[PDB]
Motif scaffolding. Sequence first.
Motif, mmCIF file in Angstrom:
data_model
loop_
_atom_site.group_PDB
_atom_site.id
_atom_site.type_symbol
_atom_site.label_atom_id
_atom_site.label_comp_id
_atom_site.label_asym_id
_atom_site.label_seq_id
_atom_site.Cartn_x
_atom_site.Cartn_y
_atom_site.Cartn_z
ATOM 1 N N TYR A 59 51.443 15.804 95.305
ATOM 2 C CA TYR A 59 50.067 15.348 95.253
ATOM 3 C C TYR A 59 49.103 16.482 95.587
ATOM 4 C CZ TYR A 59 52.513 10.859 95.435
ATOM 5 O OH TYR A 59 53.352 9.799 95.191
ATOM 6 N N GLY A 60 47.810 16.191 95.469
ATOM 7 C CA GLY A 60 46.792 17.204 95.651
ATOM 8 C C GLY A 60 45.769 16.883 96.720
ATOM 9 N N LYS A 61 44.616 17.554 96.670
ATOM 10 C CA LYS A 61 43.612 17.392 97.759
ATOM 11 C C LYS A 61 42.962 16.007 97.713
ATOM 12 C CE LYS A 61 44.488 21.651 98.810
ATOM 13 N NZ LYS A 61 45.274 21.964 100.026
ATOM 14 N N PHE B 203 59.507 -3.728 91.144
ATOM 15 C CA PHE B 203 58.313 -2.968 91.463
ATOM 16 C C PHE B 203 57.557 -2.595 90.199
ATOM 17 C CE2 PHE B 203 58.290 1.462 90.261
ATOM 18 C CZ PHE B 203 59.585 1.687 89.873
ATOM 19 N N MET B 204 56.242 -2.485 90.377
ATOM 20 C CA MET B 204 55.266 -2.155 89.353
ATOM 21 C C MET B 204 54.497 -0.921 89.806
ATOM 22 S SD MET B 204 53.964 -5.622 87.810
ATOM 23 C CE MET B 204 55.091 -6.926 87.332
ATOM 24 N N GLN B 205 54.288 0.047 88.910
ATOM 25 C CA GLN B 205 53.724 1.319 89.346
ATOM 26 C C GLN B 205 52.843 1.941 88.275
ATOM 27 O OE1 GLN B 205 56.481 4.130 91.201
ATOM 28 N NE2 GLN B 205 54.686 4.800 92.360
ATOM 29 N N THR B 206 51.823 2.666 88.738
ATOM 30 C CA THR B 206 50.930 3.444 87.888
ATOM 31 C C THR B 206 50.726 4.824 88.496
ATOM 32 O OG1 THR B 206 49.799 1.351 87.471
ATOM 33 C CG2 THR B 206 48.818 3.352 86.558
ATOM 34 N N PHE B 207 51.030 5.857 87.718
ATOM 35 C CA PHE B 207 50.776 7.245 88.067
ATOM 36 C C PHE B 207 49.628 7.772 87.222
ATOM 37 C CE2 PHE B 207 55.247 6.879 89.282
ATOM 38 C CZ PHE B 207 55.227 7.454 90.527
ATOM 39 N N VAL B 208 48.829 8.657 87.802
ATOM 40 C CA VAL B 208 47.830 9.408 87.053
ATOM 41 C C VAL B 208 47.984 10.870 87.423
ATOM 42 C CG1 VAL B 208 45.394 9.921 86.801
ATOM 43 C CG2 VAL B 208 46.197 7.576 86.702
ATOM 44 N N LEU B 209 48.325 11.694 86.434
ATOM 45 C CA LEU B 209 48.618 13.105 86.619
ATOM 46 C C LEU B 209 47.548 13.927 85.918
ATOM 47 C CD1 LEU B 209 52.323 12.860 85.420
ATOM 48 C CD2 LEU B 209 51.351 11.941 87.515
ATOM 49 N N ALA B 210 47.001 14.905 86.630
ATOM 50 C CA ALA B 210 45.962 15.765 86.100
ATOM 51 C C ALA B 210 46.455 17.198 85.979
ATOM 52 C CB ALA B 210 44.724 15.743 86.999
ATOM 53 N N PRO B 211 46.090 17.898 84.908
ATOM 54 C CA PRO B 211 46.479 19.305 84.785
ATOM 55 C C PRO B 211 45.860 20.146 85.891
ATOM 56 C CG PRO B 211 45.747 18.415 82.680
ATOM 57 C CD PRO B 211 45.369 17.416 83.721
ATOM 58 N N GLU B 212 46.554 21.223 86.271
ATOM 59 C CA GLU B 212 46.061 22.089 87.379
ATOM 60 C C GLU B 212 44.935 23.011 86.894
ATOM 61 O OE1 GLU B 212 47.877 20.884 91.030
ATOM 62 O OE2 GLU B 212 46.389 22.448 90.631
ATOM 63 N N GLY B 213 44.841 23.266 85.584
ATOM 64 C CA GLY B 213 43.774 24.091 85.068
ATOM 65 C C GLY B 213 43.939 25.569 85.335
ATOM 66 N N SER B 214 44.984 25.964 86.058
ATOM 67 C CA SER B 214 45.282 27.362 86.333
ATOM 68 C C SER B 214 46.617 27.795 85.749
ATOM 69 C CB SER B 214 45.274 27.611 87.849
ATOM 70 O OG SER B 214 46.273 26.841 88.492
ATOM 71 N N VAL C 157 50.094 14.689 90.979
ATOM 72 C CA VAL C 157 49.835 13.254 91.051
ATOM 73 C C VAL C 157 48.440 13.062 91.631
ATOM 74 C CG1 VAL C 157 50.701 11.032 91.767
ATOM 75 C CG2 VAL C 157 52.268 12.919 91.414
ATOM 76 N N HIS C 158 47.461 12.798 90.766
ATOM 77 C CA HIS C 158 46.141 12.435 91.261
ATOM 78 C C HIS C 158 46.139 11.019 91.818
ATOM 79 C CE1 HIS C 158 41.913 12.107 91.830
ATOM 80 N NE2 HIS C 158 41.608 13.176 91.120
ATOM 81 N N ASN C 159 46.845 10.101 91.166
ATOM 82 C CA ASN C 159 46.851 8.717 91.621
ATOM 83 C C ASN C 159 48.260 8.155 91.617
ATOM 84 O OD1 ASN C 159 43.942 9.063 91.083
ATOM 85 N ND2 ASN C 159 43.858 6.855 91.430
ATOM 86 N N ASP C 160 48.586 7.403 92.667
ATOM 87 C CA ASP C 160 49.886 6.753 92.804
ATOM 88 C C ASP C 160 49.656 5.339 93.316
ATOM 89 O OD1 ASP C 160 52.488 5.861 93.716
ATOM 90 O OD2 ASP C 160 53.116 7.961 93.652
#
Lengths: 138, 134, 134, 138, 134, 134, 134, 134, 38, 38, 37, 37
Positions: free
Chosen positions: F30-32, F104-115, F122-125
Amino acid sequence: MVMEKPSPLLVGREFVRQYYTLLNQAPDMLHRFYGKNSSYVHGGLDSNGKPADAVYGQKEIHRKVMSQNFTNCHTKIRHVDAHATLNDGVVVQVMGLLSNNNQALRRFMQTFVLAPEGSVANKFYVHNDIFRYQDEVF
Amino acid sequence: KPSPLLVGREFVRQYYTLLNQAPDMLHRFYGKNSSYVHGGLDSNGKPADAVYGQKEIHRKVMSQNFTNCHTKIRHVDAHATLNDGVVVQVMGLLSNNNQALRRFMQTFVLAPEGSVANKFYVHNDIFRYQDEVF
Amino acid sequence: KPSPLLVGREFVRQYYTLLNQAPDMLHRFYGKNSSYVHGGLDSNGKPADAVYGQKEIHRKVMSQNFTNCHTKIRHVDAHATLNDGVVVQVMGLLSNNNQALRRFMQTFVLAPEGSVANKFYVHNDIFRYQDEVF
Amino acid sequence: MVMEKPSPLLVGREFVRQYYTLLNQAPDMLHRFYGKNSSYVHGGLDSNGKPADAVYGQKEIHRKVMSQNFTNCHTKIRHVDAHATLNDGVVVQVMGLLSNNNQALRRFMQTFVLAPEGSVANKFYVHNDIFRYQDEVF
Amino acid sequence: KPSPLLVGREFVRQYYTLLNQAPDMLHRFYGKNSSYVHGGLDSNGKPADAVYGQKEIHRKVMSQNFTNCHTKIRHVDAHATLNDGVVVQVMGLLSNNNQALRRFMQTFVLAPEGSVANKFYVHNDIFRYQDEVF
Amino acid sequence: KPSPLLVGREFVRQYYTLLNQAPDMLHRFYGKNSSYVHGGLDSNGKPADAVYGQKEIHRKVMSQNFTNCHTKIRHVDAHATLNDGVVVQVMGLLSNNNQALRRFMQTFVLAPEGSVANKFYVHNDIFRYQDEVF
Amino acid sequence: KPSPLLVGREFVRQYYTLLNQAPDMLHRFYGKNSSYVHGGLDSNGKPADAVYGQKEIHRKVMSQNFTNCHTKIRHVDAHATLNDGVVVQVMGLLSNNNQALRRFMQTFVLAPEGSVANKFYVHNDIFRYQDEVF
Amino acid sequence: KPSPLLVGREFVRQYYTLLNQAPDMLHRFYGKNSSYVHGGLDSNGKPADAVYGQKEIHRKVMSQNFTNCHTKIRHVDAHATLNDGVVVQVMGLLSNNNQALRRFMQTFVLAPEGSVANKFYVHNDIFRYQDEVF
Amino acid sequence: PITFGDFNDGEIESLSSELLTFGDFLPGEVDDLTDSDW
Amino acid sequence: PITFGDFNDGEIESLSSELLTFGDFLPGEVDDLTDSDW
Amino acid sequence: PITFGDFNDGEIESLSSELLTFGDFLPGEVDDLTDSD
Amino acid sequence: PITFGDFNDGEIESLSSELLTFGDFLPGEVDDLTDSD
């Protein structure tokens, strides 16, 4: 496709299968299963009537294993039950039949404790082995 | 000549007793070029490919690790099939290593031998669990 | 010589299509010497015995009176057998008269005609609903 | 891929969709949904106060369909229930809202009976159509 | 700036009311290059091909043919995401044409609009029942 | 530019592999400004609110104390989103410490690092056990 | 007028052979107004309830589902009773599902069928293990 | 000291706004030792059982699962009960799940918390649809 | 040319391949008229 | 070279690609002593 | 001809075929293998 | 500042957010479409 890691039950069953297959085929290599501080007792009987004591190492357990001739051993497992214990170790309980030198099958009851080697993942050594024929005790 | 029902019932009894007692001796039930699935699933989550040849059947049987494999026969149906064969559908429950009993089905095709009369070798052995598909 | 897997898959598709599209001509799948059982119960509770002969098979089908039977084939597995025959083991859900689906286990045994290539007849048909015997 | 000729419920839902889409766009083609022995009544009121009677055919049902000058009709189905009936036919029961010429939405009830043509498989025609607005009755 | 929870809850309410009342008007919720993977079974059965653009979205919605589609919102989760977007996961029950309620999940990715603040259009809409999978 | 379906599938397998094998380094996903929720309940029964921040995610993971989590992924659907990000909708069964599997039911949202190219975080879990909220 | 000892021995050998061979056809021995009481199945298994009629007797026998039940008869006592009936009390070792040999008592009260001479049916059948009582 | 009519009006507008918008946090109006009787179904819909505490009240409210409910308030009567409590009796039209508007009564008995002035919690909540009697 | 029973190859197809149609509207002709919106 | 999180390329398979091993035997080095059987 | 229930002489005696063998097993070798083991 | 339960001043008032819109609808037209038919 998710790799995961083996469950304690599967680890214990695999160890039982591997241990008894190797014992049936190449007993001399059995010493490779144990470790530096591995205690081992295998259905012993001293010249007093009480069950024999246990060995606590590598060279002397190898010596004991040679002391038992262990040729054409036929094993028949009736019960393997494993569980997780301290330090990712697995405690295993085994019951069944064992026959050495093509003698009559005798009821055996055994308890293994496997512990991780640490440096290598998914590697276990036999920290403890307690085997007794329930014919020289019962 | 015995009844197909007779042959099927006797084979079911012998097979599901020898499976519990001495699973390593099951390989002596099959013959050359005999199909034996029993995989249920594989590494890719698919019904296992058939293993042919007594050596392969024995290897897979040993890999299955049958310990005290209890069988709970709910139904056994035997019918006569081609070349004086017998087709047996066995449905019931199975529990390996005293675990939870799982519903299973098994299809046996037993071919005879022109040499010895009243001798059958299992030409086909297909096994499946209910939970692995439903 | 097509693969037994494809042979069994095609037969399963055609059989469960004719189970509801036109159950009148279901008997055309069976040969003169052919066993058929489709999960029946008697007064004593034992599963109904199989019937033999194409005409008896047709009569039993009519007694079963399939009306728009809906099928969901969870699993089908076909394999080679005597005289290049095919044994098919199928697991699925069958709903009769638009009622609730019922789990079922089935085994087909298909024997080649020997007259024309790639032609099969249902030598054996063993159908069993799960709830009736389990 | 089991073909599995469609169930009466799916047949009825498909017919309802097709009916209330074709009527919404080209209500002229509506006549093609019926046959020689198709009885049809559609929420009519004669110059008496009682609900209108029913037409029993093709040419006069066409005439009637042009008579209510269906155009820019907005229909919203709230309930469709289909079941099998005699001769492989399907009896369909529909309730919802219908607005003609962009007037206010009107509470409507309807009963279809679809019958197989006989020659082409999976082909049905509207043997019976009974449609009434609630306000003209209640 | 509104809370992601607020935007998610308001959109859930508006979507599952407009779905019941005027399903043909759902096409406006979405925009250009928006994914709408609501679907059931196909030739493979498991995967449903996404439809992009309001044209395909409206066509697919009409294919689904919602009539009195009652919604039973068990739970709604809304969190912030990229470009000040909102990701909302809603779990509950669905009943089309007043039928048996089926468990479902839907994931929306409420993407904002740069022209006018506080506006939102559904960039991603993913729907999946429970029974079709388990 | 690889397909979002492959991206989501690879991330799903890696995430559950690390969630079982080495849960300590799960926070490294995950990130900031990432959000995390893994199915908790408060005093009043409302599903637990999400936590934000990599360190808080790590704390929550440790509190959950995943020990030998066995997982079966029944379905995964990944699709494109804003900024070439990927939204993943997963359904399956999960069981920690070798008790019975829980749906279980799950949603991930992944964002590119851009670098770094082809890098995601993982932006969202969002994770919800079915029995907890249904 | 067959000897009571002779009919007792004939019945005991026939019944145990059929029980070991075909547990399904065990009900055939009984009829109407016949009481069958055995070890008993329940939530705990302690309450052993008698069942009557071929319907219930077959259901209970199939529930107990003897599989390769090996019986070693140690003693048989047959005697005369009312209506020219035969009462049989049997001691033996019964091993079911390849378990250990367990001592048991089976007491039969057989009544003549009336129509056919030298024909009997199991009117009363009381089975009781040894270890579960003592 | 706030006026009883004023507090009754404020509570009614706030409570119905919360019910229409976010039914999840509807329990926050209540506390400990608060009685909540609101229609409900036990086995037939007739047995209505009061529930107590925020735990049970939220569970019952979520079981009811109001979706988009438009509450048109026709009349409100507020009065002063004991120990400076307020009693509210409300008439209106309730439409749940976009169904038909139905008349109802909702009698509230509100008690001051005690710590913060001009603060009240729903001590008693007796709701009854008018179309359940008559 | 895989066949079963006395069914000709493709006999089952021809028989079970007809699509659900209404009135005389050939399966599909209603779809165009229906989608006559934007 | 597709990576997730801050993990290095191939680190995931490096950590998870450890076969189940027992004693001092190498993986697959215990089943070889028991071939040539029935 | 002393039979019981819906049985005549012949059925279960033929239903117990001790001569039937499967595989290479000698007649009764499997049985003995199970018994007393 | 009169509130009820654990609510502070106007959290529910912010929750209301009548000015929120989605898609192409004018504010509240969906509400008006559904409440009254």
